[PDB]
Amino acid sequence: ELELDEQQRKRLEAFLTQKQKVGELKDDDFEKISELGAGNGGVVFKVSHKPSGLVMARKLIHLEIKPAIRNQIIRELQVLHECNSPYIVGFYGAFYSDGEISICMEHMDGGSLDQVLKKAGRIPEQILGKVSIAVIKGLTYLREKHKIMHRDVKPSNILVNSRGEIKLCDFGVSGQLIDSMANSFVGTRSYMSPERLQGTHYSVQSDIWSMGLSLVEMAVGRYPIPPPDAKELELMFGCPMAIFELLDYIVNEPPPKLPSGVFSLEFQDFVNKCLIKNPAERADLKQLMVHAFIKRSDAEEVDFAGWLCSTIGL
Ligand SMILES: Nc1ncnc2c1ncn2[C@@H]1O[C@H](COP(=O)(O)OP(=O)(O)O)[C@@H](O)[C@H]1O
Numbered sequence: 001e002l003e004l005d006e007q008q009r010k011r012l013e014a015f016l017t018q019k020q021k022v023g024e025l026k027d028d029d030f031e032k033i034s035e036l037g038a039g040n041g042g043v044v045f046k047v048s049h050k051p052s053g054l055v056m057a058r059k060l061i062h063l064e065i066k067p068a069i070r071n072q073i074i075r076e077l078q079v080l081h082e083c084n085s086p087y088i089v090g091f092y093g094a095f096y097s098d099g100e101i102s103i104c105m106e107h108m109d110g111g112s113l114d115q116v117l118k119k120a121g122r123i124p125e126q127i128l129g130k131v132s133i134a135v136i137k138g139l140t141y142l143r144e145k146h147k148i149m150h151r152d153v154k155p156s157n158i159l160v161n162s163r164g165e166i167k168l169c170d171f172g173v174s175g176q177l178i179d180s181m182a183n184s185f186v187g188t189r190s191y192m193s194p195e196r197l198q199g200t201h202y203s204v205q206s207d208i209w210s211m212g213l214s215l216v217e218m219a220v221g222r223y224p225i226p227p228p229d230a231k232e233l234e235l236m237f238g239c240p241m242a243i244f245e246l247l248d249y250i251v252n253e254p255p256p257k258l259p260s261g262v263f264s265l266e267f268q269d270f271v272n273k274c275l276i277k278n279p280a281e282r283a284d285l286k287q288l289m290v291h292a293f294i295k296r297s298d299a300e301e302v303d304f305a306g307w308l309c310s311t312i313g314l
């Protein structure tokens with residue numbers, strides 16, 4: 001099902017054509033336009049590649065490591081030059097300079113779903129149907145073409161654009177980067193699967209759980225753990241916990257679920273199959289792709305771009 005349609009193929013070709021015109025990426029060739037956001041890993045800027053005139057997203061990872069480590073990081077990232085999917089954020093290149101790695105990617109003018117959610121309050125089921133399709137296909141592509149899993153699915157890692165595209169970013173492609181990064185830390189574990197938090201199972205199944213959790217959060221307008229109360233429910237639809245406590249809850253308590261009545265049973269069943277604690281009982285990518293919720297959503301003519309622009313005010 002990784003077949004690309006006409007419009008998708010055209011967009012990929014255009015991206016590659018533009019990329020080919022870009023030569024070696026150099027620090028001084030960039031002009032900052034604005035700060036897109038930050039993380040405990042690095043900051044992200046909307047920049048302009050002066051020579052090509054191309055607009056890009058530049059992620060700066062401040063690391064005073066040896067000129068050796070950074071070189072291994074840059075090398076491992078080179079693999080993204082062949083990663084071309086309508087569901088994965090475009091890659092321009094990477095380089096080091098002034099004590100910090102730079103990662104240049106396709107700029108997504110709609111921002112991340114975490115940002116979109118803040119403005120929306122909550123995202124409509126039909127809109128989440130398109131998001132689900134994109135995420136599954138993105139995970140499928142990474143697994144198939146690059147034989148890897150995302151490892152960090154969450155709202156802030158799902159980007160969208162005025163073109164109506166939905167793409168994944170920040171997948172674990174460079175083991176060294178993950179290592180160098182996973183040495184320090186500061187990257188939420190709140191969307192990690194119970195098996196990963198227990199150190200038992202670690203596969204694509206883990207990414208499916210994270211997606212299911214992200215879907216619930218987006219549907220109800222709040223991180224769903226722990227579960228809301230009748231009060232919240234009636235408030236949300238009319239109709240604190242320290243990090244370490246949260247992680248234990250996830251591992252020990254029953255998974256979150258969507259409230260009844262407000263969402264179709266197909267959507268509820270879909271997230272339920274994603275949120276089964278036992279990674280073996282939890283649905284897999286092939287099963288999700290043919291799930292009734294996905295089949296229905298795929299056949300729905302949803303103007304995602306329109307809804308998005310109206311919601312964030314583009
Ligand atoms: N390619 C991009 N286009 C537009 N915005 C982006 C892009 N990449 C990242 N961002 C924004 O920059 C923010 C910071 O990214 P990041 O450093 O990975 O911290 P986070 O854990 O929130 O993802 C993201 O939350 C997202 O809103």
Ligand SMILES: N#CC(=C(/N)Sc1ccccc1N)/C(C#N)=C(\N)Sc1ccccc1N
Pocket residue numbers: 059061080088089090091103105150151152168169170171172173174175177178179181182
């Ligand atoms: N490699 C890598 C990236 C990571 N965030 S590493 C990671 C992943 C999952 C869980 C833990 C860790 N530590 C990353 C960065 N920075 C990128 N893939 S850059 C990138 C490259 C092409 C398109 C979009 C993006 N964000």
Ligand SMILES: [Ca+2]
Pocket residue numbers: 027028
């Ligand atoms: Ca410089």
Ligand SMILES: [Mg+2]
Pocket residue numbers: 039156157169170
């Ligand atoms: Mg991110």
Ligand code: NA
Pocket residue numbers: 027028098
């Ligand atoms: Na600089």
